[PDB]
Amino acid sequence: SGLKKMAQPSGCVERCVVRVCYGSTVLNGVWLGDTVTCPRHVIAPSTTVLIDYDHAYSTMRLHNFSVSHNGVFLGVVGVTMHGSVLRIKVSQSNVHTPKHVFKTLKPGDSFNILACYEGIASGVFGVNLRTNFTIKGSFINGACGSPGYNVRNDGTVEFCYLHQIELGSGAHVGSDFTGSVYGNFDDQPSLQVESANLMLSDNVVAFLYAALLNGCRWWLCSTRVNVDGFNEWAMANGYTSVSSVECYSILAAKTGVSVEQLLASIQHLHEGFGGKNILGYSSLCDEFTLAEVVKQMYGVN
Numbered sequence: 001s002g003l004k005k006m007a008q009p010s011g012c013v014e015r016c017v018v019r020v021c022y023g024s025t026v027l028n029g030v031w032l033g034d035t036v037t038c039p040r041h042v043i044a045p046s047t048t049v050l051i052d053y054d055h056a057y058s059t060m061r062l063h064n065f066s067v068s069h070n071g072v073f074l075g076v077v078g079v080t081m082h083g084s085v086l087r088i089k090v091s092q093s094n095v096h097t098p099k100h101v102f103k104t105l106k107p108g109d110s111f112n113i114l115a116c117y118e119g120i121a122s123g124v125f126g127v128n129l130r131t132n133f134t135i136k137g138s139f140i141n142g143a144c145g146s147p148g149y150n151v152r153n154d155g156t157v158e159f160c161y162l163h164q165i166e167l168g169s170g171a172h173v174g175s176d177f178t179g180s181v182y183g184n185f186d187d188q189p190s191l192q193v194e195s196a197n198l199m200l201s202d203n204v205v206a207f208l209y210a211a212l213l214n215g216c217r218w219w220l221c222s223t224r225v226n227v228d229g230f231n232e233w234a235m236a237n238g239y240t241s242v243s244s245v246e247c248y249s250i251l252a253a254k255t256g257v258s259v260e261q262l263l264a265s266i267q268h269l270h271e272g273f274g275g276k277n278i279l280g281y282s283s284l285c286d287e288f289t290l291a292e293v294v295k296q297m298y299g300v301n
């Protein structure tokens, strides 16, 4: 039993990370085959004023790159720019390149961030892409380029995030590997503020199924609320819509509690826990996808 917000093992990704230097600026790159992808502001001239990236890229000289890994040398052959990322071609093909694909996160999706500095993985943690296209992460200076990823069952790494910026709120933004910044924020020192963050209802439902299956039932209401009724309530209260109730059929089954009843319970529980806890949490928790709960409670053989 238990529910921990865990990260998929980081090993396959650790060996794809590299230090990318331009001038004196240093951040992380993701080396797959003979390409290091990395955030493009490694070439930015300065933080305070708006950056002409077109100009920076046209005036960018290869001789000021230095791409290393654990002290070893990767040569730069050339550099293209694609949205907010550079694709640095390099002389060696990363022998540790994993079977991978590039995949763009929708909000609600969960993924793993490997926090890296100077091309070295320092930490790993799970996180959800929020409705406002930010994540709540922990990144200090030098964390840009830290990759985010998921790993499928066939061992396939889905590379889906490259850390780029921290908004004034503390919320974190990155791009996918095509260079599209999540939520169409700009990788500039500008004043951008994120929309309001909604509670990811689906994840709250899965959380509550998990609580049930871990013998935590005190909160459970005898009220039922249908999907349309819930969705309407949600808009008014800072919550997302809830997906088809059939998604949860396995957990409905195993607990004998319907989504409808959990949706209702969500509404009462919105008002506070009264000093009680649900699996340790003191307010409702949307950290966990359905898939996470199912995998964590049932997902071996």
Ligand SMILES: *[C@@](O)(C(=O)NCc1ccccc1)[C@H](C[C@@H]1CCNC1=O)NC(=O)[C@H](Cc1ccccc1)NC(=O)/C=C/c1ccccc1
Residues within 6 Å of the ligand: 025, 026, 027, 041, 044, 046, 047, 051, 139, 140, 141, 142, 143, 144, 145, 164, 165, 166, 167, 168, 172, 187, 188, 189, 190, 191, 192
């Ligand atoms: C990255 O780690 C990074 O770009 N590092 C470059 C670097 C500078 C100095 C020494 C070593 C490396 C960093 C990550 C931030 C820092 C704290 N937490 C983070 O997530 N990114 C930034 O500092 C960026 C830099 C930048 C990018 C693009 C254009 C200009 C500057 N800046 C910001 O995150 C703050 C800009 C901002 C954006 C919106 C609203 C307010 C402020």
